[PDB]
Write a protein that binds this ligand. Sequence first.
Ligand SMILES: Nc1nc2c(ncn2[C@@H]2O[C@H](COP(=O)(O)OP(=O)(O)O)[C@@H](O)[C@H]2O)c(=O)[nH]1
Ligand SMILES: Nc1nc2c(ncn2[C@@H]2O[C@H](COP(=O)(O)OP(=O)(O)O)[C@@H](O)[C@H]2O)c(=O)[nH]1
Ligand SMILES: O=P(O)(O)OC[C@H]1O[C@@H](n2cnc3c(OP(=O)(O)O)ncnc32)[C@H](O)[C@@H]1O
Ligand SMILES: O=P(O)(O)OC[C@H]1O[C@@H](n2cnc3c(OP(=O)(O)O)ncnc32)[C@H](O)[C@@H]1O
Ligand SMILES: O=CN(O)CC(=O)O
Ligand SMILES: O=CN(O)CC(=O)O
Ligand SMILES: [Mg+2]
Ligand SMILES: [Mg+2]
Lengths: 424, 424
Amino acid sequence: GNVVAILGAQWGDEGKGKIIDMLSEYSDITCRFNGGANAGHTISVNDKKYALHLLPCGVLYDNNISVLGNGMVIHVKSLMEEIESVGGKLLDRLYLSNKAHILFDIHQIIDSIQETKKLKEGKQIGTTKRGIGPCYSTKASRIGIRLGTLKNFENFKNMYSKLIDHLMDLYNITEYDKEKELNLFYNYHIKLRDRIVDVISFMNTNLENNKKVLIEGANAAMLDIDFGTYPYVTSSCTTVGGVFSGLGIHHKKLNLVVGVVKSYLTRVGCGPFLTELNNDVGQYLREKGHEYGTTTKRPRRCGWLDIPMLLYVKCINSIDMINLTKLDVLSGLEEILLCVNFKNKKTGELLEKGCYPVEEEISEEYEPVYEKFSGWKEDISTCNEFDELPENAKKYILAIEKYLKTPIVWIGVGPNRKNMIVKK
Amino acid sequence: GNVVAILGAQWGDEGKGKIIDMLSEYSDITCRFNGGANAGHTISVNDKKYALHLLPCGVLYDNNISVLGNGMVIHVKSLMEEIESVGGKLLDRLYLSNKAHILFDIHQIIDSIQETKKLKEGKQIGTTKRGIGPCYSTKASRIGIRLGTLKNFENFKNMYSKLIDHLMDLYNITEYDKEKELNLFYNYHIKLRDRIVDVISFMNTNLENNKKVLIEGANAAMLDIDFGTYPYVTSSCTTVGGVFSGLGIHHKKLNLVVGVVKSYLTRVGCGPFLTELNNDVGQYLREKGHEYGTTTKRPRRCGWLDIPMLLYVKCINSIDMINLTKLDVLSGLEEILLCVNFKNKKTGELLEKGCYPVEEEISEEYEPVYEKFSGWKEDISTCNEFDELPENAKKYILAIEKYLKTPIVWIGVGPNRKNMIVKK
Ligand SMILES: Nc1nc2c(ncn2[C@@H]2O[C@H](COP(=O)(O)OP(=O)(O)O)[C@@H](O)[C@H]2O)c(=O)[nH]1
Ligand SMILES: Nc1nc2c(ncn2[C@@H]2O[C@H](COP(=O)(O)OP(=O)(O)O)[C@@H](O)[C@H]2O)c(=O)[nH]1
Ligand SMILES: O=P(O)(O)OC[C@H]1O[C@@H](n2cnc3c(OP(=O)(O)O)ncnc32)[C@H](O)[C@@H]1O
Ligand SMILES: O=P(O)(O)OC[C@H]1O[C@@H](n2cnc3c(OP(=O)(O)O)ncnc32)[C@H](O)[C@@H]1O
Ligand SMILES: O=CN(O)CC(=O)O
Ligand SMILES: O=CN(O)CC(=O)O
Ligand SMILES: [Mg+2]
Ligand SMILES: [Mg+2]
């Protein structure tokens, strides 16, 4: 338990920021390794909420060290804002990978241009419009500018101009205020240059010094560029392989993987959602659990828990233990449905376990098979122990553990750091 | 040793195809998981050479199963050619990921367009012009077409047209024969559709059935999009994290990692090369070891072995054992230089161990520090045992093991499958 990875097993917003903040009480380093500001991780202490998009969620601890890995696409403008918002001496314990890619405002513009075009074609992805996809695209084309370059403003200014001019031409972006963004980056250069370091060595050194590292996942498994519901996914690797490729440490350094699983499902953006509840039950889940995008404020689509999805994710990420979150939101429902299988509406055959119809046109052929679970009316946000929970909640929890053959260690019963039940 | 990954630790062409073919004698499945046809893996049996670019190098065994993972960008046209070239009943044991991206001819066109533009700017990468970068770019933008779609020709044809029209407009490609490529893909559809399957489940099932899996790396660590000498790198993850993200299996499934290290260095394409020998010694290495691109036929740049590079790669990929290749090529040199450190020419300070100046402008400031090793004149391509090798060769080998704190298990003394010494 010296090197722990927290990975969402669904379509994000499973409660990653919450467990990171909680576990950061006993961790030395907390790292982000993929995506960028599309991520929205909410921390809540005594009901005072804090939302992070680029900095890891261990920032509330004066001693915690924040690390942004090489696998990220960083909107430096947003980064600076979060840094100053945290304040204190955060900079003295901030380590920004000199290999991470810089996400400029033009990346966001292209993101919107692409989405606008697709909207007219009726195939928009519903991205967060934070320019994530376009930044990973320039990374692939290898014209993206990485953080290390920002350490030398002279060289940076020159490279910056060429990338922007190239992109403006490529996407016909007629006007972009290069002078304004450039001057802003000078400020970024001044305040961040000494914090742009070799995270590879920093990680190896600290691991050798027996430091405890918390790896914060962004987005989630079903949004993985490769394994998610393509094209309705993010453009980075959000799965376990990404912990190594996005941070610069090898597989033997990872001690365990915590899968963050919400008691019910949500996804925000377009794409398939087999157990989607576009009715009053969905409204109940969204309102009681206030399911609105931490980043875009968009209303999240809600639905029932999906077991086949989790078996698929277990194959991909491996899951040592589960953090079952927002169980408290299900309080009040007379019945809870658990999707334990998918049946093909055309052939009548059941979907093979471990398989998942990620493709929109294949998903369409499946019908969910539900197991009925009696609900509970008690407010469980006050429960401190597993045994204190009403019986019907226990059965739900136990049923989940059984089907996934994975232990549920942390039960979430509220957005606050304290609202967590530990199942010894 | 049930699940083994073979990863090049330098800039490719370390002899991966050779060890894959060798080890495939005792493996059930051999998988490719990254890149595409930019890779050129040479197999040699009784001096008859075979070069693969997309199919794994286990194809010479009538019982071996070939797997192409989700993380690849596949030029289907080239794939079909290699399939038919192998012949036999290869199709009955070919498993193509339905998640892998299809690389069209237009991807190659864009690759050349981009390189031509950069050439005029004096910053060409020197890509293999196989359209790899542009295909990973369309993957990131999520408009790329994946193999699964090819199973339904009706749907494929329609999606194909839209991607090509979009790209033609984007890059002003005025003429592209859509009808010709389309009709060719119909043929691909017919002969490959039933082989386009769920590799995720196939892998999990076979691993559960105790099948022995060989994971064939493409390109190499120093060409890794994140960890390599950016922008002079390939656009896929060529490191260990990529084995998981490109194949759909988790980190606990990997039993060991073999690092393929050439006795000297080569790289083909532009970019930094600290120990480069652009002189007669370089010519000796290139001619004796016939260092010409397996894919492009371009002459490979040659230089001395680089220890700091390997310590860096060990941090990234982890190395359980090393396959030191082409030691036979060094026969005849009066002296062999091993780069054991890098000294900053400006400050006079030594580069920290485990660190590597990947950036062109930072690399420029370093000077290699060499350790002199006496050479040997004997032809060692006949040596069958480690003890049979001349003493000076042993010292070189032993010196390498010592500095990397990693055992050298397989010594290559010839291009043929048999030309391998096992160091018990
Ligand atoms: N009621 C309730 N809310 C929770 C619980 N855990 C987290 N939340 C809240 O649920 C929301 C999840 O959204 P978000 O923070 O974007 O998820 P993340 O991306 O995984 O960090 C946040 O507003 C959290 O404060 C829980 O156990 N119960
Ligand atoms: N002399 C010699 N040649 C070798 C040895 N191992 C491999 N080769 C040859 O070296 C070349 C390496 O190029 P390539 O096949 O592209 O490397 P790969 O990408 O790692 O498979 C090939 O032509 C091999 O046949 C060895 O031990 N000695
Ligand atoms: O190109 P993008 O901007 O990444 O959009 C692609 C798709 O992915 C969704 N998405 C991306 N990051 C997400 C997130 O992250 P966290 O759990 O870390 O807070 N939580 C929920 N949904 C998320 C977007 O809504 C869209 O459908
Ligand atoms: O966009 P790309 O076409 O990938 O080019 C980017 C850079 O990477 C090099 N390169 C790519 N794959 C390579 C390879 O693979 P294997 O060891 O698998 O045979 N061996 C050697 N060099 C290789 C190219 O020459 C270029 O410098
Ligand atoms: O927490 C982030 N999301 O839920 C995504 C969004 O806000 O769109
Ligand atoms: O084996 C492939 N290479 O060496 C790359 C090339 O041919 O350019
Ligand atoms: Mg979120
Ligand atoms: Mg090669």
